[PDB]
Design a binder for this molecule. Structure first.
Ligand SMILES: [Cl-]
Lengths: 97, 265
């Protein structure tokens, strides 16, 4: 019994160009626990990425939050790459403004 | 309608995403304590936990858990051998209870092998609900040790709700169930050249909220696309609901007794 995760990319505060924020990537409802999560900026990988305390729901399916402080530029393209045991090729989820 | 929960996780061969043992506690949605097979120490994951709790508490529960680490390894190794399982496998455990606003209390104890229900404790009959023949042989060994079943029953029935009450009096966020949502409505272009109305609520606490869209007062669930309640990181949450605009619409939100209706120009 293996579950594909549900990937959701969004900002901590409502988006404003030039002001500081945080880019969140909330991975949830997957099994087993081994999940590789990376935050991206114009293709390139974000080096400094902090993550939340792993927890599991009552359906024993884990959830995590990965976030990074960022200043949304006008032209900047942000996304979230995720790979699990259930994924043959990593899923990339673009941030929508 | 507050709750206290502690879980345990054990993994066989974790090639990256180790360690083999992790134990984390929560008062509602707040992480409070942590332990893992690497840092063989129980630690606070909240500031009001660092203060208020004497170093005796951490030392006693570090020793306890170091032992629960060894039991978990044994209990799991055993499980894979009763099956014909090889490789990496997951074993999870969960205790805790709730304090319902009326005054009534609940409390649970569950176990799972590979994210599937294995053993469920019924505290009112001091019994285990075994899933297969493997679980039934483990259940049988557990039922003979009566004082353990009573220790568990009593921990939920007494000790757990007492501890939750103490943790809640170290709450100026946990006890505080009032942080109102900040709702805004903005037109998006979901498909070219289709426009959609977006209701966006943020910065609220606790995370229980309800929002909907209504065409001329009629709520149309089949035309509405709802978003999940999400963590922000700052301890507050965000959510949204959207509607497909055709060639009078209003947004509705309820949160901690507060009721608000927003209307599009
Ligand atoms: Cl125990």
């Amino acid at each position: 019994i293996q579950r594909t995760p549900k990937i959701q990319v969004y900002s901590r505060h409502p988006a404003e160009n030039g002001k500081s924020n945080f880019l969140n990537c909330y991975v949830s409802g997957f099994h087993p626990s081994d999940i590789e999560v990376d935050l991206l900026k114009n293709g390139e990988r974000i080096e400094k990425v902090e993550h939340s305390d792993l927890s599991f729901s009552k359906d024993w399916s884990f959830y995590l939050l990965y976030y990074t402080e960022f200043t949304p530029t006008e032209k900047d393209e942000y996304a979230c790459r995720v790979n699990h045991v259930t994924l043959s090729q990593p899923k990339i989820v673009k941030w929508d403004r | 309608t507050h709750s206290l929960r502690y879980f345990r996780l054990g993994v066989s061969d974790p090639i990256h995403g180790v360690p083999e043992f992790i134990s984390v506690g929560y008062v509602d949605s707040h992480p409070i304590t942590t332990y893992d097979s690497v840092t063989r120490q129980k630690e606070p994951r909240a500031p009001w936990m660092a203060e208020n709790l004497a170093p005796d508490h951490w030392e006693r529960y570090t020793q306890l858990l170091r032992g629960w680490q060894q039991m978990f390894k044994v209990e799991l190794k055993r499980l894979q051998r009763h099956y014909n399982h090889s490789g990496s496998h997951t074993y999870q455990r969960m205790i805790g209870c709730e304090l319902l606003e009326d005054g009534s209390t609940t409390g649970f104890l569950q176990y799972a092998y590979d994210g599937q229900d294995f053993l469920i404790f019924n505290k009112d009959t001091l019994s285990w609900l075994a899933v297969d023949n493997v679980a039934h042989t483990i259940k049988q060994a557990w039922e003979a040790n009566q004082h353990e079943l009573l220790y568990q029953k009593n921990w939920l029935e007494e000790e757990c709700i007492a501890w939750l009450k103490r943790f809640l009096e170290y709450g100026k966020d946990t006890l505080q169930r009032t942080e109102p949502p900040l709702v805004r409505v903005n037109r998006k272009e979901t498909f070219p050249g289709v426009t959609a109305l977006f209701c966006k609520a943020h910065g609220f606490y606790p995370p229980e909220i309800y929002m909907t869209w209504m065409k001329n007062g009629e709520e149309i669930v089949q035309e509405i696309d709802y978003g999940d309640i999400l963590p922000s990181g700052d301890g507050t949450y965000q959510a949204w609901a959207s509607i497909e605009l055709d060639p009078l619409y209003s947004c509705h939100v309820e949160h901690s007794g507060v009721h608000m209706v927003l209307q599009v120009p």
